[PDB]
Design a protein around this ligand. Structure first.
Ligand SMILES: CCCCCCCCCCCCCCCC(=O)O
Ligand SMILES: [Fe+3]
Ligand SMILES: [Fe+3]
Length: 223
């Protein structure tokens, strides 16, 4: 209780202006990514549209969280934060590389979100806590969607996935490093963020059909 941040302080609002922007930007990117995957999987378009609509609801919810605290979201900072990963997604999209697009959005980004949201909930203000608790359940759904498709297609895309992991897992690690200072002002421990991210991602890779040697090797790419 004494560990809860002072949500009204200038220090908190400053850090929140960047963290809030990143979440808003991320939800919008998630929407765009699922719609984009629909161009690669035309028979999945209705399901992907449903996922994308959920992302827009998350975006509006988190936008409201910033407004509730009297915070103005630093959207330029957020756009720059996502740019490297965004670039890799767009490159894969342009090459028709569906498994790479799904690993980036449905596995890496969803796991990062899940981890972040779980870590934020216990230290969040009462308004944002309700919103975030609602969102987390949806992200499980998104993770499961990506897991299911990759699991069904693993034998044809194994090597591409290893490559996508090698290229993109370090970007998530760099993002975690970049967000850590502001996250700490929000009373979130970077070690919790890293642990819960790796656990979520490891569990998804297990579901997809990777063995321990493979997953240890993949986790090691973050170095
Ligand atoms: C609401 C504040 C939570 C704490 C935020 C800590 C920084 C992590 C930001 C990652 C958000 C990624 C958004 C992806 C959303 C999705 O894929 O549905
Ligand atoms: Fe979302
Ligand atoms: Fe999502």
């Amino acid at each position: 209780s004494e560990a809860l941040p002072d949500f009204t302080s200038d220090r908190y609002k400053d850090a929140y202006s960047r963290i809030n922007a990143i979440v808003i930007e991320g939800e919008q990117e998630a929407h765009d990514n699922y719609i984009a995957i629909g161009t690669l999987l035309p028979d999945h378009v209705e399901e992907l549209k449903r996922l994308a609509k959920m992302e827009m609801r998350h975006k509006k919810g988190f936008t409201a969280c910033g407004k509730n605290l009297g915070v103005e979201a630093d959207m330029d900072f957020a756009r720059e934060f996502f740019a490297p990963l965004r670039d890799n997604f767009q490159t894969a999209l342009g090459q028709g590389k569906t498994p790479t697009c799904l690993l980036i959005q449905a596995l890496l980004i969803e796991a990062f979100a899940i981890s972040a949201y779980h870590t934020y909930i216990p230290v969040s203000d009462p308004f944002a806590r309700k919103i975030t608790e609602g969102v987390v359940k949806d992200e499980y759904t998104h993770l499961n969607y990506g897991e299911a498709w990759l699991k069904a297609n693993l034998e044809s895309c194994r090597e591409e996935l290893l490559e996508a992991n090698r290229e993109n897992l370090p970007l998530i690690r760099r993002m975690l490093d970049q967000v850590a200072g502001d996250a700490a002002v929000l009373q979130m421990d970077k070690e919790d963020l890293i642990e819960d991210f790796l656990i979520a991602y490891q569990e998804s890779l297990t579901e997809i059909g990777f063995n321990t040697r493979e997953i240890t090797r993949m986790a090691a790419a973050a170095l």
